[PDB]
Coordinates of C-alpha atoms and ligand atoms in Angstrom, one line a residue:
Chain N
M1 CA 73.0 -31.4 6.8
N2 CA 71.1 -28.0 6.1
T3 CA 72.0 -24.3 6.7
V4 CA 70.2 -21.1 7.8
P5 CA 72.4 -18.3 6.6
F6 CA 72.1 -14.9 8.2
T7 CA 72.3 -11.7 6.0
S8 CA 74.0 -9.9 8.8
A9 CA 73.9 -9.4 12.7
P10 CA 73.3 -5.5 12.9
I11 CA 72.2 -5.6 16.7
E12 CA 73.6 -7.4 19.7
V13 CA 71.5 -10.4 20.3
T14 CA 71.6 -13.9 21.9
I15 CA 70.6 -16.5 19.2
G16 CA 69.3 -19.9 19.9
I17 CA 68.9 -23.0 18.0
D18 CA 67.0 -25.6 19.8
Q19 CA 68.8 -26.0 23.2
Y20 CA 71.9 -24.2 22.1
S21 CA 72.5 -20.6 22.1
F22 CA 75.5 -18.2 21.5
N23 CA 76.2 -14.4 22.0
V24 CA 76.6 -12.2 18.8
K25 CA 77.9 -8.7 19.2
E26 CA 76.6 -5.9 17.4
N27 CA 77.7 -5.9 13.7
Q28 CA 79.7 -9.0 14.3
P29 CA 80.3 -10.9 11.0
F30 CA 78.1 -13.6 11.8
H31 CA 76.2 -15.3 8.8
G32 CA 74.3 -18.2 10.1
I33 CA 74.0 -21.9 11.3
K34 CA 75.2 -24.9 9.4
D35 CA 75.2 -28.8 9.9
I36 CA 71.5 -28.6 11.2
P37 CA 70.2 -32.2 11.6
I38 CA 67.7 -33.1 8.8
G39 CA 64.7 -34.9 10.1
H40 CA 63.6 -32.9 12.9
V41 CA 61.8 -29.6 13.4
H42 CA 63.9 -26.7 14.8
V43 CA 63.4 -23.3 16.4
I44 CA 65.7 -20.5 16.1
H45 CA 65.2 -17.8 18.6
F46 CA 66.5 -14.3 19.6
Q47 CA 66.8 -12.1 22.7
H48 CA 68.0 -8.6 22.0
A49 CA 70.9 -7.3 24.3
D50 CA 69.0 -4.2 24.9
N51 CA 65.5 -5.4 25.4
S52 CA 65.5 -8.9 26.9
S53 CA 61.6 -8.3 26.9
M54 CA 60.2 -10.2 23.8
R55 CA 62.0 -13.4 23.3
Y56 CA 60.9 -14.5 19.9
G57 CA 61.7 -17.2 17.2
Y58 CA 60.8 -19.5 14.3
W59 CA 59.8 -23.1 14.0
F60 CA 60.9 -24.6 10.7
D61 CA 62.1 -27.8 8.9
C62 CA 64.7 -27.7 6.3
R63 CA 63.0 -30.4 4.3
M64 CA 60.4 -27.8 3.4
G65 CA 62.4 -25.0 1.8
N66 CA 65.5 -22.8 2.1
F67 CA 65.2 -20.3 4.9
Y68 CA 67.3 -17.6 5.9
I69 CA 67.3 -14.7 8.5
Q70 CA 67.6 -11.1 7.8
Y71 CA 67.3 -8.2 10.4
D72 CA 64.6 -5.8 9.6
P73 CA 65.5 -2.3 11.0
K74 CA 61.8 -1.0 10.5
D75 CA 60.2 -3.8 12.7
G76 CA 63.3 -4.1 14.7
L77 CA 63.6 -7.8 14.7
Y78 CA 65.5 -10.8 13.0
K79 CA 63.0 -12.1 10.4
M80 CA 62.9 -15.6 8.8
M81 CA 62.3 -15.6 5.1
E82 CA 62.3 -18.2 2.4
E83 CA 64.6 -18.2 -0.6
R84 CA 62.9 -19.7 -3.7
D85 CA 65.8 -19.5 -6.1
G86 CA 67.8 -22.6 -5.0
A87 CA 71.0 -21.6 -7.0
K88 CA 71.2 -18.2 -5.3
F89 CA 71.0 -20.0 -1.9
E90 CA 73.4 -22.7 -2.5
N91 CA 75.6 -20.1 -3.7
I92 CA 75.3 -17.8 -0.9
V93 CA 75.7 -20.6 1.7
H94 CA 78.9 -22.1 0.1
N95 CA 80.5 -18.6 0.1
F96 CA 79.8 -18.2 3.8
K97 CA 81.0 -21.6 4.5
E98 CA 84.1 -21.2 2.5
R99 CA 84.8 -17.9 4.6
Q100 CA 83.7 -19.9 7.9
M101 CA 81.5 -17.2 8.9
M102 CA 78.9 -19.8 10.3
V103 CA 78.6 -21.9 13.5
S104 CA 78.0 -25.4 13.4
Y105 CA 74.9 -27.1 15.1
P106 CA 77.0 -28.4 17.9
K107 CA 75.2 -31.8 18.1
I108 CA 77.1 -34.3 20.4
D109 CA 76.7 -37.6 18.7
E110 CA 75.7 -39.5 21.9
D111 CA 72.9 -36.9 22.6
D112 CA 69.4 -37.6 21.8
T113 CA 67.9 -34.8 23.6
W114 CA 66.5 -32.9 20.8
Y115 CA 65.0 -36.0 19.3
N116 CA 63.5 -36.8 22.5
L117 CA 61.9 -33.4 23.1
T118 CA 60.5 -33.2 19.5
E119 CA 59.8 -36.8 18.9
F120 CA 56.1 -36.3 18.0
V121 CA 56.1 -32.6 17.0
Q122 CA 55.5 -32.2 13.2
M123 CA 55.6 -28.8 11.1
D124 CA 52.2 -29.6 9.5
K125 CA 50.7 -29.4 13.1
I126 CA 52.7 -26.5 14.3
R127 CA 51.2 -24.5 11.3
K128 CA 47.7 -25.2 12.5
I129 CA 48.3 -24.1 16.0
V130 CA 50.2 -21.1 14.6
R131 CA 48.1 -19.8 11.7
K132 CA 50.0 -17.9 8.9
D133 CA 49.8 -20.1 5.8
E134 CA 51.7 -17.9 3.4
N135 CA 55.1 -18.9 5.2
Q136 CA 56.4 -22.6 5.6
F137 CA 57.9 -21.6 9.1
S138 CA 56.0 -20.2 12.2
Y139 CA 56.8 -17.2 14.4
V140 CA 56.2 -17.6 18.2
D141 CA 57.0 -15.1 20.9
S142 CA 56.8 -14.5 24.7
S143 CA 53.6 -12.3 24.5
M144 CA 51.3 -14.4 22.1
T145 CA 48.1 -15.5 23.9
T146 CA 46.2 -18.8 23.4
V147 CA 42.7 -19.2 22.0
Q148 CA 41.5 -20.2 25.5
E149 CA 43.2 -17.2 27.1
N150 CA 41.4 -14.9 24.8
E151 CA 38.0 -16.5 25.6
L152 CA 38.4 -15.7 29.3
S153 CA 42.5 -10.1 21.8
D154 CA 43.8 -10.2 18.3
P155 CA 42.9 -13.6 16.7
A156 CA 45.6 -13.4 14.0
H157 CA 48.5 -13.6 16.4
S158 CA 46.9 -16.5 18.7
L159 CA 48.3 -19.9 19.6
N160 CA 45.5 -22.2 18.5
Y161 CA 46.1 -25.0 21.0
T162 CA 43.2 -27.5 21.6
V163 CA 41.0 -26.1 24.3
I164 CA 41.0 -28.5 27.4
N165 CA 38.6 -27.5 30.2
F166 CA 37.7 -29.8 33.1
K167 CA 34.5 -28.0 34.0
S168 CA 33.0 -27.9 30.5
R169 CA 30.1 -29.7 28.9
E170 CA 32.6 -31.2 26.6
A171 CA 34.5 -32.8 29.5
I172 CA 31.5 -33.9 31.3
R173 CA 28.7 -36.2 30.1
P174 CA 25.2 -35.5 31.3
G175 CA 24.4 -38.1 34.0
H176 CA 28.2 -39.0 34.5
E177 CA 28.9 -35.7 36.3
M178 CA 30.8 -37.2 39.1
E179 CA 32.2 -40.2 37.2
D180 CA 33.7 -38.0 34.6
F181 CA 34.9 -35.3 36.9
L182 CA 36.9 -37.6 39.1
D183 CA 37.8 -40.1 36.3
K184 CA 38.6 -38.3 33.1
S185 CA 39.2 -41.3 30.8
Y186 CA 36.2 -40.4 28.8
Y187 CA 37.4 -37.0 28.1
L188 CA 41.0 -38.3 27.3
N189 CA 40.0 -41.4 25.2
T190 CA 36.8 -40.7 23.4
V191 CA 36.7 -36.8 23.2
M192 CA 40.4 -35.9 22.8
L193 CA 42.3 -39.1 21.6
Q194 CA 39.6 -40.7 19.3
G195 CA 37.7 -37.4 18.6
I196 CA 40.0 -34.4 18.2
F197 CA 43.6 -35.7 17.9
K198 CA 42.8 -39.0 16.3
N199 CA 45.7 -40.6 17.9
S200 CA 48.2 -40.3 20.8
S201 CA 51.0 -39.1 18.7
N202 CA 49.1 -35.8 17.7
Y203 CA 48.4 -35.4 21.3
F204 CA 52.0 -35.8 22.4
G205 CA 53.0 -33.6 19.6
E206 CA 51.0 -30.8 20.9
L207 CA 52.1 -31.3 24.4
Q208 CA 55.8 -31.3 23.5
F209 CA 55.3 -28.2 21.3
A210 CA 53.5 -26.4 24.2
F211 CA 56.4 -27.2 26.5
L212 CA 58.9 -25.9 24.1
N213 CA 57.2 -22.7 23.5
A214 CA 56.9 -22.3 27.5
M215 CA 60.8 -23.0 27.9
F216 CA 62.1 -21.0 25.0
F217 CA 59.7 -17.9 25.0
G218 CA 58.5 -17.9 28.4
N219 CA 55.0 -18.2 26.7
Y220 CA 52.8 -18.6 29.9
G221 CA 49.7 -19.9 27.9
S222 CA 51.9 -22.6 26.5
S223 CA 52.8 -23.6 29.9
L224 CA 49.2 -23.8 30.9
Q225 CA 48.5 -26.0 27.9
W226 CA 51.5 -28.2 28.8
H227 CA 50.3 -28.6 32.4
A228 CA 46.7 -29.3 31.1
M229 CA 47.6 -32.0 28.6
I230 CA 49.5 -33.8 31.4
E231 CA 46.9 -33.4 34.0
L232 CA 44.2 -34.9 31.7
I233 CA 46.2 -38.0 31.2
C234 CA 47.3 -38.3 34.9
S235 CA 43.5 -37.9 36.1
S236 CA 42.4 -40.7 33.9
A237 CA 42.2 -44.2 35.5
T238 CA 42.1 -45.8 32.1
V239 CA 45.1 -44.9 29.7
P240 CA 46.7 -47.2 27.2
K241 CA 49.9 -48.7 28.4
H242 CA 52.1 -47.5 25.5
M243 CA 50.9 -43.9 26.2
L244 CA 51.9 -44.1 30.0
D245 CA 55.3 -45.4 29.0
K246 CA 56.0 -42.8 26.5
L247 CA 54.7 -40.1 28.6
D248 CA 57.2 -41.0 31.3
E249 CA 59.9 -40.8 28.9
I250 CA 58.6 -37.3 27.3
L251 CA 58.3 -35.6 30.7
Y252 CA 61.6 -36.9 31.8
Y253 CA 63.5 -35.4 28.9
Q254 CA 61.5 -32.1 29.5
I255 CA 62.2 -31.9 33.2
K256 CA 65.8 -32.7 32.4
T257 CA 66.3 -29.9 29.9
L258 CA 64.5 -27.2 31.9
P259 CA 66.8 -24.6 33.2
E260 CA 67.4 -25.3 37.0
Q261 CA 66.5 -21.6 37.8
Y262 CA 63.4 -21.5 36.0
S263 CA 61.6 -24.1 37.8
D264 CA 59.7 -21.6 40.0
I265 CA 57.7 -20.3 37.1
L266 CA 57.5 -23.0 34.5
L267 CA 56.5 -25.9 36.9
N268 CA 53.0 -25.9 38.6
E269 CA 53.2 -27.5 42.1
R270 CA 49.6 -28.5 42.1
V271 CA 49.8 -30.4 38.8
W272 CA 53.0 -32.1 39.5
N273 CA 52.2 -33.3 43.1
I274 CA 48.8 -34.5 41.9
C275 CA 50.2 -36.1 38.9
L276 CA 53.1 -37.8 40.9
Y277 CA 51.6 -38.4 44.2
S278 CA 47.8 -38.4 44.1
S279 CA 46.5 -39.4 40.5
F280 CA 45.6 -42.6 39.1
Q281 CA 49.0 -42.6 37.3
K282 CA 50.8 -41.8 40.5
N283 CA 52.8 -45.1 40.2
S284 CA 53.2 -45.1 36.3
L285 CA 55.8 -42.3 35.9
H286 CA 59.0 -43.7 37.5
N287 CA 61.5 -41.8 35.4
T288 CA 59.9 -38.6 35.7
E289 CA 59.2 -38.9 39.4
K290 CA 62.9 -40.0 40.1
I291 CA 64.2 -37.0 38.3
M292 CA 61.8 -34.6 39.7
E293 CA 62.6 -35.6 43.2
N294 CA 66.4 -35.4 42.8
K295 CA 66.2 -32.1 40.8
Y296 CA 63.4 -30.1 42.3
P297 CA 62.4 -31.9 45.8
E298 CA 61.6 -28.3 46.9
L299 CA 58.6 -28.0 44.6
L300 CA 57.2 -31.2 46.3
Chain Y
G1 CA 32.8 -13.9 44.8
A2 CA 32.5 -15.2 48.3
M3 CA 29.7 -14.1 50.9
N4 CA 30.9 -12.3 54.0
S5 CA 30.1 -9.6 56.6
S6 CA 30.7 -6.9 53.9
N7 CA 28.1 -7.9 51.4
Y8 CA 25.5 -9.1 53.9
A9 CA 22.6 -7.1 52.7
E10 CA 22.7 -8.8 49.2
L11 CA 20.9 -11.7 50.7
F12 CA 17.7 -9.6 50.9
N13 CA 17.7 -7.8 47.6
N14 CA 15.3 -8.8 44.8
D15 CA 17.7 -11.3 42.9
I16 CA 16.6 -14.8 43.7
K17 CA 19.1 -16.8 45.6
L18 CA 19.4 -19.9 47.7
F19 CA 21.7 -21.4 50.3
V20 CA 22.6 -25.0 50.1
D21 CA 23.9 -26.6 53.3
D22 CA 24.9 -30.3 52.8
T23 CA 26.0 -31.0 56.4
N24 CA 23.0 -33.4 57.2
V25 CA 23.0 -35.1 53.9
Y26 CA 25.1 -38.2 55.0
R27 CA 24.3 -39.0 58.6
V28 CA 25.8 -42.1 60.5
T29 CA 25.7 -43.6 64.0
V30 CA 29.1 -45.3 64.7
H31 CA 28.9 -48.6 66.7
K32 CA 30.9 -51.7 67.7
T33 CA 30.7 -55.0 65.7
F34 CA 30.4 -58.4 67.5
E35 CA 34.0 -58.8 66.8
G36 CA 34.8 -55.6 68.5
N37 CA 35.3 -53.6 65.3
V38 CA 33.6 -50.4 64.5
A39 CA 30.9 -49.9 61.9
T40 CA 28.6 -47.1 60.9
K41 CA 24.8 -47.4 60.1
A42 CA 23.5 -44.6 58.1
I43 CA 20.3 -42.8 59.0
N44 CA 18.3 -40.6 56.8
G45 CA 19.3 -37.2 55.9
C46 CA 18.5 -33.9 54.2
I47 CA 19.5 -31.1 52.0
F48 CA 18.8 -27.8 53.3
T49 CA 18.2 -25.3 50.4
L50 CA 16.9 -22.0 51.6
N51 CA 15.6 -18.8 50.0
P52 CA 17.0 -16.2 52.7
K53 CA 14.6 -13.5 51.3
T54 CA 11.1 -15.5 51.3
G55 CA 12.1 -18.3 53.9
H56 CA 11.1 -20.9 51.4
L57 CA 12.9 -24.2 52.3
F58 CA 13.4 -27.0 49.8
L59 CA 13.9 -29.9 52.3
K60 CA 15.2 -32.8 50.2
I61 CA 15.1 -35.9 52.3
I62 CA 17.9 -38.4 51.6
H63 CA 16.8 -41.9 52.3
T64 CA 19.4 -44.2 53.4
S65 CA 18.8 -46.5 50.4
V66 CA 20.6 -44.0 48.2
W67 CA 23.9 -45.1 50.0
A68 CA 23.2 -48.9 49.4
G69 CA 26.4 -50.6 47.8
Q70 CA 28.2 -47.2 47.2
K71 CA 31.8 -46.3 48.1
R72 CA 33.3 -43.2 49.3
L73 CA 29.9 -42.0 50.9
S74 CA 31.3 -38.6 52.1
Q75 CA 32.4 -37.9 48.6
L76 CA 29.2 -39.3 47.0
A77 CA 27.3 -37.1 49.5
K78 CA 28.5 -34.0 47.9
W79 CA 27.6 -35.0 44.4
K80 CA 24.2 -36.4 45.4
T81 CA 23.5 -32.8 46.9
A82 CA 24.8 -31.2 43.8
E83 CA 22.7 -33.6 41.6
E84 CA 19.4 -32.9 43.8
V85 CA 20.0 -29.0 43.8
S86 CA 20.4 -29.1 39.9
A87 CA 17.2 -31.2 39.6
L88 CA 15.4 -28.6 41.8
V89 CA 16.4 -25.6 39.8
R90 CA 15.4 -27.6 36.5
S91 CA 12.1 -28.3 38.1
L92 CA 11.5 -24.7 38.8
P93 CA 9.9 -22.2 36.3
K94 CA 12.4 -20.0 34.7
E95 CA 11.3 -16.9 36.6
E96 CA 11.7 -18.7 39.8
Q97 CA 15.2 -20.1 39.2
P98 CA 18.0 -18.5 41.1
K99 CA 20.4 -16.2 40.0
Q100 CA 23.0 -17.3 42.5
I101 CA 23.4 -20.5 44.7
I102 CA 25.6 -20.0 47.9
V103 CA 27.1 -23.1 49.4
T104 CA 27.9 -23.1 53.1
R105 CA 30.9 -25.5 52.7
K106 CA 33.6 -24.9 50.0
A107 CA 33.7 -28.6 49.2
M108 CA 30.4 -28.2 47.3
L109 CA 31.6 -25.6 44.8
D110 CA 33.0 -28.2 42.1
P111 CA 30.3 -30.8 42.6
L112 CA 27.6 -28.1 42.1
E113 CA 29.5 -26.2 39.4
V114 CA 29.8 -29.4 37.3
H115 CA 26.1 -30.4 37.7
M116 CA 25.0 -26.9 36.9
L117 CA 27.0 -26.5 33.6
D118 CA 23.7 -26.2 31.6
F119 CA 23.1 -23.0 33.8
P120 CA 26.1 -20.7 33.1
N121 CA 24.3 -17.7 34.2
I122 CA 23.8 -18.9 37.9
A123 CA 26.7 -18.0 40.1
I124 CA 27.9 -20.6 42.5
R125 CA 29.4 -18.8 45.4
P126 CA 31.3 -19.9 48.7
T127 CA 30.8 -17.9 51.8
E128 CA 33.0 -16.8 54.7
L129 CA 30.2 -16.7 57.4
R130 CA 30.0 -19.7 59.8
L131 CA 26.3 -20.3 59.4
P132 CA 24.6 -22.6 61.8
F133 CA 22.4 -24.6 59.2
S134 CA 23.7 -27.9 60.5
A135 CA 21.3 -27.3 63.6
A136 CA 18.3 -27.6 61.2
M137 CA 17.9 -31.1 62.6
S138 CA 17.3 -29.6 65.9
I139 CA 13.9 -28.3 64.8
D140 CA 11.7 -31.0 65.9
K141 CA 9.3 -30.9 62.9
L142 CA 11.9 -31.1 60.4
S143 CA 13.9 -33.8 62.3
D144 CA 10.5 -35.8 62.4
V145 CA 9.8 -35.8 58.6
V146 CA 13.3 -36.7 57.9
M147 CA 13.5 -39.9 60.1
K148 CA 9.8 -41.0 59.1
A149 CA 10.7 -41.0 55.5
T150 CA 10.6 -44.4 53.9
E151 CA 11.6 -43.2 50.4
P152 CA 13.2 -40.1 48.7
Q153 CA 11.0 -37.1 49.2
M154 CA 10.9 -33.4 49.0
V155 CA 9.0 -31.3 51.7
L156 CA 8.2 -27.7 51.5
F157 CA 8.2 -25.4 54.6
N158 CA 8.5 -21.6 55.3
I159 CA 11.4 -21.5 57.9
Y160 CA 10.1 -18.0 58.9
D161 CA 6.5 -19.2 59.7
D162 CA 4.6 -16.0 59.3
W163 CA 7.2 -13.7 60.6
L164 CA 7.5 -11.5 57.3
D165 CA 4.1 -10.3 57.9
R166 CA 5.5 -8.3 60.7
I167 CA 9.4 -8.0 60.2
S168 CA 11.7 -7.6 57.2
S169 CA 13.7 -10.5 55.7
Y170 CA 17.0 -9.1 57.1
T171 CA 15.3 -9.3 60.7
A172 CA 13.9 -12.6 59.9
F173 CA 17.2 -14.2 58.8
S174 CA 19.0 -12.8 61.9
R175 CA 16.2 -14.4 64.2
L176 CA 16.6 -17.6 62.3
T177 CA 20.3 -17.8 62.7
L178 CA 20.4 -16.8 66.3
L179 CA 17.9 -19.6 67.0
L180 CA 20.0 -22.0 65.0
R181 CA 23.2 -20.9 66.5
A182 CA 21.7 -21.5 70.0
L183 CA 20.2 -24.8 69.2
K184 CA 23.8 -25.8 67.9
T185 CA 25.7 -24.6 70.9
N186 CA 23.5 -26.0 73.6
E187 CA 20.4 -27.9 72.1
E188 CA 18.9 -28.7 75.5
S189 CA 19.0 -25.2 76.7
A190 CA 17.8 -23.6 73.5
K191 CA 14.9 -26.0 73.4
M192 CA 14.0 -25.3 77.1
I193 CA 13.9 -21.6 76.3
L194 CA 11.5 -22.0 73.4
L195 CA 8.8 -24.4 75.1
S196 CA 9.2 -23.3 78.8
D197 CA 5.9 -21.5 79.0
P198 CA 3.2 -24.0 78.0
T199 CA 0.7 -21.3 76.9
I200 CA 2.8 -20.4 73.9
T201 CA 2.1 -23.0 71.3
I202 CA 3.3 -23.9 67.7
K203 CA 0.8 -23.8 64.9
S204 CA 0.1 -27.0 63.2
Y205 CA 1.7 -25.3 60.0
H206 CA 4.6 -23.8 61.8
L207 CA 8.0 -24.8 62.9
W208 CA 8.4 -22.3 65.8
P209 CA 6.0 -21.0 68.6
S210 CA 3.6 -18.2 68.1
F211 CA 5.5 -15.5 70.1
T212 CA 4.3 -12.0 70.3
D213 CA 6.6 -9.2 69.4
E214 CA 7.4 -8.5 72.9
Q215 CA 8.0 -12.3 73.6
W216 CA 10.2 -12.6 70.6
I217 CA 12.5 -9.8 72.1
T218 CA 12.7 -11.7 75.3
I219 CA 13.3 -15.1 73.5
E220 CA 16.0 -13.5 71.5
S221 CA 17.7 -12.1 74.5
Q222 CA 17.7 -15.4 76.3
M223 CA 19.2 -17.1 73.3
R224 CA 22.0 -14.4 73.2
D225 CA 22.7 -15.1 76.9
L226 CA 22.9 -18.8 76.1
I227 CA 25.4 -18.3 73.3
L228 CA 27.7 -15.9 75.5
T229 CA 27.4 -18.4 78.4
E230 CA 28.4 -21.5 76.5
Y231 CA 31.3 -19.5 75.0
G232 CA 32.2 -18.9 78.7
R233 CA 31.6 -22.4 80.0
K234 CA 33.7 -23.4 77.0
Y235 CA 36.5 -20.9 77.2
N236 CA 36.0 -20.1 80.9
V237 CA 35.7 -16.2 80.8
Ligands
VF9_401 C1 4.4 -20.5 49.7 C2 4.0 -22.0 49.3 O1 2.9 -22.2 49.1 N1 4.8 -22.9 49.9 C3 4.6 -24.3 49.8 C4 4.1 -24.7 50.9 C5 4.5 -24.5 52.4 C6 4.8 -23.1 52.7 C7 6.2 -22.8 51.9 C8 6.1 -22.4 50.6 C9 7.3 -23.1 49.6 C10 8.3 -23.6 50.0 C11 8.9 -23.9 48.9 C12 8.3 -23.5 48.0 O2 7.2 -22.8 48.4

């Protein structure tokens, strides 16, 4: 079990860790989060009491270093940092634990939600979408735009998701225009899976990462990317059987976890109705369709 | 953007553009089978690709063999159209390629966009106008060359005959659409108007009769009356 200590909490903030959150009052004696499960990525995120604008946070993996949070009064945010002196860190954490100034990552033992939402998400891939190689962790916030969004303005702060565009030469073979536009299996299997992502795990990892940035930060370009990666699969007549079964499981846990009150802006009617009721895979997503109908039958 | 009443004059400026109408590409007669069921038999069609400034018409005749053994013909028809328009642009010299292509039916936008990916600088636009180009097969010479074709064939026509020697493109397009709107609302009456006087003939190299200016004004009036009537006869007014 690993720990992210906080130097202090000088401003009132709602702190998230994965799917959990808690309110911390201004100058409340809060000094971090312990018992974080090893073996998964995590995201710690912040929404200031005073400016609910800008949700922001940090993707990290405790196996890659000792990380802490410290507020910066100049830049006005909680920053992640790495402590390279391991003894200084163990010593700080142990003192905070002894004074019980830390919250416990409150994982119910029956619960596999976090594993199921991050199954294919790997820090090494996160760090290639979020480019900042001097840190082992990754900052994301509400307002960061994607490579693709910029094409249609600061590159250093972009989300470098894989560009997917159904009406692009990449997507459409010369001479197969109507075949490839109506049945994207070429674009999925040859271009994306075999060509760009190498395997379905890396595909699913980007898809799950895009969903999580949409949900946690309201990051709109992330939401666009999550839906585009779903639609590419749903619109391919020919998809490996194992991919479709895993997709159903992936999407199920994403819909399950979505706040019921955010379904208006995080879910794209056209994509979901096409994917569940009109696409080639209209019959291959039983769990996802069952939960969508019982939870958001209005959207449909 | 879309083409409508407000940007109407843009059709006659000096940027090359074409309309594509696909209504007559996939054409069928529906009949009864011996077992009392219903079947279609395709007949020849065409694409109607028109320069509204110059009158140049690229009539691409769609032979019934193109449908042989194919499924979902109404959807295939849009992509065939798009394929044939794209082949047409590619065949034209660079200085003759359009800067815009306006489709008369929004269902052509995606098929033509995809076929034209190699032409990123050619704008594919829909329109809000209810243009009467489906009636192009009421023009006897065009109807004749389509039905007679025994293979795929491009035929070239000026749909304005010689009118531009005397009138502007704005006025030539207004005449053409009035004629085609009349032919669409009541073909029999429209054709009666055009041929009633046996002394007015159609040149061998023209589609319409050789009317004087004064006679065109009479003809145009008669076509307006027809369209208003049929709007009465239809709506009882
Ligand atoms: C001006 C010209 O020589 N032609 C071809 C012959 C028929 C008259 C129409 C015109 C045309 C149509 C399409 C392209 O060019």
